[PDB]
Amino acid sequence: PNLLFSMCGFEVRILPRQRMEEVVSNDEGVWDLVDERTKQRTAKAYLKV
């Protein structure tokens, strides 16, 4: 389910909201990925250093 990568010093774990099997409100160190058109949030990007 995960898609990992890292750029600069950021490490990013991309979970599509689909396969998370649960959607939980999470802290501010976690991005929400918003589609262009549907204006939805389809994936959470977890950030670490």
């Binding site: 929400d32 918003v34 549907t38 204006k39 939805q40 949030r41």
Partner: protein
């Protein structure tokens, strides 16, 4: 009108997490009456539908759009 803006930000945030899909289900199951009049008072329904179409969504207003033609 300040409060109007408040509502605007409220639903415009509340959409992005649900995505306008779950929105219609929750609302339709949340029995909001005073905000979504089906009982009558045409002009108020004009204000509601015109308002949500002013937000830029308006897809919550179809059930009320029917009641426009039913009033006329």
């Amino acid at each position: 009108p300040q409060g109007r803006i408040f509502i605007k930000f409220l639903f415009q945030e509340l959409v992005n997490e649900l995505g306008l899909d779950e929105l219609q289900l929750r609302l339709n199951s949340s029995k909001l009456d005073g905000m979504f009049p089906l009982e009558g008072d045409a002009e108020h329904i004009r204000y509601s539908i015109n308002f949500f179409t002013a937000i830029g969504l308006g897809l919550l207003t179809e059930d009320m759009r029917s009641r426009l033609t039913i009033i006329q």
